[PDB]
Amino acid sequence: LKNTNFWMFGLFFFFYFFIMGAYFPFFPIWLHDINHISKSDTGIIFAAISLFSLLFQPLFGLLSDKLGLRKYLLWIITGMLVMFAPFFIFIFGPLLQYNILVGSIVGGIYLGFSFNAGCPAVEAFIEKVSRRSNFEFGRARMFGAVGWALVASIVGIMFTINNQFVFWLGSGMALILAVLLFFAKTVANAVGANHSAFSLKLALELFRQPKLWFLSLYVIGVSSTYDVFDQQFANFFTSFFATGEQGTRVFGYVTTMGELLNASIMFFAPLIINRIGGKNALLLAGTIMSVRIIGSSFATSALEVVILKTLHMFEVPFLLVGSFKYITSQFEVRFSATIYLVAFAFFKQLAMIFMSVLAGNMYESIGFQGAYLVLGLVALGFTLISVFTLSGPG
Amino acid sequence: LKNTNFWMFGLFFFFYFFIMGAYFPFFPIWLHDINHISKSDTGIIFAAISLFSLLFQPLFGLLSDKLGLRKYLLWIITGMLVMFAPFFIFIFGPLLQYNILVGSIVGGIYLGFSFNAGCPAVEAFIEKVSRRSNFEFGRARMFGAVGWALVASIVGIMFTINNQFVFWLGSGMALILAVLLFFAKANHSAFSLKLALELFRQPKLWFLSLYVIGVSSTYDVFDQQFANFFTSFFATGEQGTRVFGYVTTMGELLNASIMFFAPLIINRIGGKNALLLAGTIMSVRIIGSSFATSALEVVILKTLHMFEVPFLLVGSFKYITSQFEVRFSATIYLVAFAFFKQLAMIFMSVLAGNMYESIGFQGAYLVLGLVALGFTLISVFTLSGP
Numbered sequence: 035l036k037n038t039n040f041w042m043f044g045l046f047f048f049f050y051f052f053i054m055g056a057y058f059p060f061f062p063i064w065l066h067d068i069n070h071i072s073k074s075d076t077g078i079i080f081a082a083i084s085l086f087s088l089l090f091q092p093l094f095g096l097l098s099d100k101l102g103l104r105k106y107l108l109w110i111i112t113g114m115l116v117m118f119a120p121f122f123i124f125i126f127g128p129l130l131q132y133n134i135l136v137g138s139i140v141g142g143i144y145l146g147f148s149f150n151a152g153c154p155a156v157e158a159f160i161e162k163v164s165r166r167s168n169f170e171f172g173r174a175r176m177f178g179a180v181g182w183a184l185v186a187s188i189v190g191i192m193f194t195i196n197n198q199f200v201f202w203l204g205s206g207m208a209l210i211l212a213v214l215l216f217f218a219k220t221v222a223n224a225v226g227a228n229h230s231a232f233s234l235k236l237a238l239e240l241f242r243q244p245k246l247w248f249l250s251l252y253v254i255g256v257s258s259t260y261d262v263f264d265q266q267f268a269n270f271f272t273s274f275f276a277t278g279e280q281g282t283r284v285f286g287y288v289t290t291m292g293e294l295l296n297a298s299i300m301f302f303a304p305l306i307i308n309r310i311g312g313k314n315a316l317l318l319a320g321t322i323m324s325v326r327i328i329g330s331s332f333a334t335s336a337l338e339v340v341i342l343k344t345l346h347m348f349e350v351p352f353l354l355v356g357s358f359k360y361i362t363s364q365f366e367v368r369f370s371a372t373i374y375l376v377a378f379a380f381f382k383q384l385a386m387i388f389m390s391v392l393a394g395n396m397y398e399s400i401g402f403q404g405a406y407l408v409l410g411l412v413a414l415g416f417t418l419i420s421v422f423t424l425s426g427p428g
Numbered sequence: 429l430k431n432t433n434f435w436m437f438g439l440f441f442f443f444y445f446f447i448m449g450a451y452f453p454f455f456p457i458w459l460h461d462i463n464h465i466s467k468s469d470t471g472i473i474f475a476a477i478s479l480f481s482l483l484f485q486p487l488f489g490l491l492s493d494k495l496g497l498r499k500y501l502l503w504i505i506t507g508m509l510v511m512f513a514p515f516f517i518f519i520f521g522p523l524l525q526y527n528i529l530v531g532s533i534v535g536g537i538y539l540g541f542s543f544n545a546g547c548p549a550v551e552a553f554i555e556k557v558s559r560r561s562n563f564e565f566g567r568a569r570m571f572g573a574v575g576w577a578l579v580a581s582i583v584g585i586m587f588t589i590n591n592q593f594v595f596w597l598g599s600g601m602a603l604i605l606a607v608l609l610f611f612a613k614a615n616h617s618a619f620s621l622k623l624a625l626e627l628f629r630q631p632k633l634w635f636l637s638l639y640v641i642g643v644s645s646t647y648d649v650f651d652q653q654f655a656n657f658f659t660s661f662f663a664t665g666e667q668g669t670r671v672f673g674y675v676t677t678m679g680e681l682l683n684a685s686i687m688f689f690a691p692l693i694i695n696r697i698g699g700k701n702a703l704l705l706a707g708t709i710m711s712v713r714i715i716g717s718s719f720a721t722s723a724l725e726v727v728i729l730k731t732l733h734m735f736e737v738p739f740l741l742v743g744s745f746k747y748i749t750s751q752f753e754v755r756f757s758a759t760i761y762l763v764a765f766a767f768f769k770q771l772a773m774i775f776m777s778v779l780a781g782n783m784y785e786s787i788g789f790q791g792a793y794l795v796l797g798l799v800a801l802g803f804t805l806i807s808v809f810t811l812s813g814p
């Protein structure tokens with residue numbers, strides 16, 4: 035309402051999703067369209083993205099939650115963010131062009147994990163400040179969602195003109211804006227509080243129950259398959275458009291409009307989830323997941339691929355809250371700590387290391403639409419197996 | 429549009445007016461409110477400010493224009509700017525508190541002239557880069573005006589909390605930002621003694637000089653310590669700087685908006701009338717400040733400074749352009765606008781500073797408001813006709 039720390043972190047949510055909004059959606063276009071990198075090479079890039087995510091994400095889930103609460107980690111993340119443009123334009127870009135991809139990927143994910151493994155730890159850090167004060171994390175998260183939307187259109191429109199200055203703008207937002215939010219720093223009943231910790235015996239007891247294994251199979255079979263599908267979908271999407279400018283213009287307009295569609299539906303989504311149930315609503319996401327990949331295998335027009343892109347926005351709430359309420363309804367509260375780590379974060383990244391290579395090589399071999407039928411078949415395949423992930427009903 | 433040197437120098441306009449926006453408007457408040465310096469002492473500080481300006485400004489007008497074009501001078505200015513905070517917090521601040529003002533003023537203006545005499549030379553150096561390329565100086569100067577406005581509100585709001593870190597921010601802005609702009613690296617006039625001697629032969633200069641000394645210097649001195657007088661009308665110490673921060677920021681947006689449409693007015697009214705209009709609004713503010721009673725009344729007096737500026741910037745330009753030979757313009761700016769104004773401001777700052785200690789702010793404001801309006805009435809007859 036008037037909380038001084040609220041604006042400190044509300045703008046921090048906005049100015050981080052500014053740099054997040056610049057990098058992530060326009061990352062594959064910057065590799066193929068701009069850096070002229072092949073489909074197999076991009077497959078190697080995204081495999082290394084998932085590898086550093088598998089290493090750094092569990093390290094931050096133990097740090098930020100326990101010792102990291104003293105703002106030390108958040109400064110390190112900002113230290114990398116300050117040198118956003120003098121990395122892509124000066125270090126990252128030429129290392130890829132050097133034709134040695136193996137040498138290049140290592141140095142590439144060192145600044146890459148600040149968004150992949152970095153963001154959940156930053157979102158967990160602002161989750162703690164919101165619980166300490168009056169302001170709610172839900173309204174604080176929405177402050178940043180507009181920053182993701184504002185950039186997506188601005189980068190999409192200004193890309194073909196000069197992508198170099200949009201990168202040169204993001205680094206500045208981490209420099210002139212992020213530091214200002216850092217110098218001005220820091221009996222209670224919480225509405226939602228997750229003060230959890232994990233151990234080897236907690237994980238060993240989690241391995242005793244088959245519930246985890248059937249859940250893991252959905253995370254690997256369906257989710258990882260779909261997550262890999264989106265890694266290089268942008269290049270396939272842009273191809274359907276009249277010009278090179280027409281591709282990025284519409285792709286910029288879609289992620290911006292899609293975010294407003296996502297937040298609007300994610301709002302009314304818990305009402306639906308509670309009536310459908312955790313298992314059934316999770317499978318609702320799996321159908322709208324696989325229908326997009328399998329629909330992409332027969333894609334013919336530009337307005338047809340626009341309709342396919344929006345499906346991703348109908349999918350997200352039924353999997354964000356869908357995964358939450360499943361663990362909440364089918365697992366002990368104490369186990370939730372290992373669950374996110376073991377399945378949601380470890381098994382998903384391990385599957386995404388190999389799946390990204392195989393699909394990346396499939397675009398080089400059988401093409402986009404060719405690979406989409408293979409991945410669309412397996413995602414729908416595991417979705418049909420997920421109907422009987424507990425016991426055979428009657 | 430896409431000029432690589434435009435962004436390298438447009439941001440240079442922004443990040444300099446960042447440090448300019450920190451120092452200049454909040455300089456008197458840092459002396460009286462913070463350093464606890466008297467009105468007579470501040471009068472001595474501003475006299476030394478005008479003395480180093482009278483010495484360094486003519487030296488840079490000959491350097492940057494001729495030899496200085498090889499970026500050597502711009503590097504020296506940045507060398508002082510890097511040590512902005514380790515000067516005010518470490519050297520300048522204690523020297524004043526060492527209750528020896530004479531010893532302190534000398535060392536104070538060595539970094540002080542980097543903004544007073546420094547800025548016109550920086551604005552002239554960048555005027556040359558704009559002339560060399562596609563991008564225009566008019567749009568490049570505006571790039572920096574937002575930097576002056578962004579800081580003014582940020583310093584005004586954060587001052588009472590910790591003024592030490594805002595100073596610690598400006599020095600870094602010259603360090604991490606200005607150096608990066610250095611790795612990535614028409615008025616062609618000259619002046620002489622005979623040009624200046626031919627200038628003294630014509631009475632036009634003397635009548636113009638009298639307006640620059642009588643009216644302008646009087647008004648410029650008035651603003652040197654007005655901020656302290658303004659902050660007094662406000663509910664708290666926080667209320668003074670908050671509104672003073674909001675006013676210079678809003679006033680800049682009001683100034684740029686009106687200076688845009690101003691040349692249209694000037695060309696219809698004439699050069700003399702533009703100066704006569706600027707002088708009336710100048711003296712009315714000073715004389716109005718002598719009877720000031722409320723906080724929203726002083727806010728209205730502060731905005732009048734923003735109504736005045738275009739009628740004197742372009743007002744002075746078109747007068748020389750319309751009543752003097754193009755060759756003479758080089759000396760004109762040095763002789764009256766820069767030398768006579770600073771010489772008058774050396775003594776006027778001492779006398780007015782001593783007047784606040786003697787007859788107070790409002791008291792001094794009637795003496796200065798009477799003379800400024802006095803010279804404005806004589807400028808109706810003295811100044812060269814339209």
Ligand SMILES: *SCCO[C@@H]1O[C@H](CO)[C@H](O)[C@H](O)[C@H]1O
Pocket residue numbers: 051153154157178179182293296350
């Ligand atoms: S750490 C949160 C970032 O996740 C992304 O958030 C944006 C904008 O808020 C969109 O919701 C994307 O779908 C998420 O991947």
Ligand SMILES: *SCCO[C@@H]1O[C@H](CO)[C@H](O)[C@H](O)[C@H]1O
Pocket residue numbers: 445547548551572573576680683737
């Ligand atoms: S070299 C600049 C001196 O002029 C001042 O510039 C600031 C920043 O834009 C404002 O225009 C002030 O009104 C001027 O005094």
Ligand SMILES: [Ba+2]
Pocket residue numbers: 228
């Ligand atoms: Ba949570």
Ligand SMILES: [Ba+2]
Pocket residue numbers: 615
């Ligand atoms: Ba000029």
